[PDB]
Amino acid sequence: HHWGYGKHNGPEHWHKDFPIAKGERQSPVDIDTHTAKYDPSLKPLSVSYDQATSLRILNNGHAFNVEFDDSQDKAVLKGGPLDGTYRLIQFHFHWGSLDGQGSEHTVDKKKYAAELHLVHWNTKYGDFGKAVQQPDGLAVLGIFLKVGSAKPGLQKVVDVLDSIKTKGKSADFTNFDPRGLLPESLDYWTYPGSLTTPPLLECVTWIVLKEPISVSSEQVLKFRKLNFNGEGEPEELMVDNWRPAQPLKNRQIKASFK
Ligand SMILES: Cc1cccc(C(=O)[SeH])c1
Numbered sequence: 001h002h003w004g005y006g007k008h009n010g011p012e013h014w015h016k017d018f019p020i021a022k023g024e025r026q027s028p029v030d031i032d033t034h035t036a037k038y039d040p041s042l043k044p045l046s047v048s049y050d051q052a053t054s055l056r057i058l059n060n061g062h063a064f065n066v067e068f069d070d071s072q073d074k075a076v077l078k079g080g081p082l083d084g085t086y087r088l089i090q091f092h093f094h095w096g097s098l099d100g101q102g103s104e105h106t107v108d109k110k111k112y113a114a115e116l117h118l119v120h121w122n123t124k125y126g127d128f129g130k131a132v133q134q135p136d137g138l139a140v141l142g143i144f145l146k147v148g149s150a151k152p153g154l155q156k157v158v159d160v161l162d163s164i165k166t167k168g169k170s171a172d173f174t175n176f177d178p179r180g181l182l183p184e185s186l187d188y189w190t191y192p193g194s195l196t197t198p199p200l201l202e203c204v205t206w207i208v209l210k211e212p213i214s215v216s217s218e219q220v221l222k223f224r225k226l227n228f229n230g231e232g233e234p235e236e237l238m239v240d241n242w243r244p245a246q247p248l249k250n251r252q253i254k255a256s257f258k
């Protein structure tokens, strides 16, 4: 009876196995754009993905991860609110059954169709497993998806999904360039939070970009053909793999822009 996104194992149940679900810095949150304060002391983000080495795509039963070689400083996130150098390990999405829901963060209560998470770990902690035990261990770059024009740089991801339909399936996924998933502007909001899935560890500096990327209805329809189940198990579409907004508590969301 493992955690998931169903009636019987979804976000309202997670606190029984993961009591930090009711913690002081849980994610996601609603971003109240009028309350977020411009912090003129933040720096421009530095997103340096030129040397990225993608390896593999995995359906883990909750989402799909595009995994990177993080055994060297290749693809790194620095600057903005961050102290030091954060190495890209994987990206994944959260998405809806319908275009009107799917994002985890909201903006003035607006839900986007999906949300991309580019996961990075602080290299001062040596490995990802050590980094998730630290309050500044991860930096996740969150990018909203709206449905309109296709995103050409997403199509290589879309077109491999039929090969990882079910939980535990993986496929080689080399030479994928995550720069093709970024919007034009790196204006962002930032706050201290958590993983949005179990184990819900409070180890994340969130950096949520203001500008969404546009994807086509056909692109997101292909996300929605994935399965939560394993091969040879009843088909359960992988949709609505998002956690709703959690209490902000004693936190401030800072803006990089006026
Ligand atoms: C996950 C999955 C299964 C079967 C077909 C598709 C298409 O892209 Se069409 C995707």
Ligand SMILES: Cc1cccc(C(=O)[SeH])c1
Pocket (backbone or CB within 6 Å): 117, 119, 140, 195, 196, 197, 198, 199
């Ligand atoms: C379980 C886990 C590990 C690393 C990152 C996440 C998210 O971005 Se949500 C979740």
Ligand SMILES: [Zn+2]
Pocket (backbone or CB within 6 Å): 092, 093, 094, 117, 196
């Ligand atoms: Zn995520």
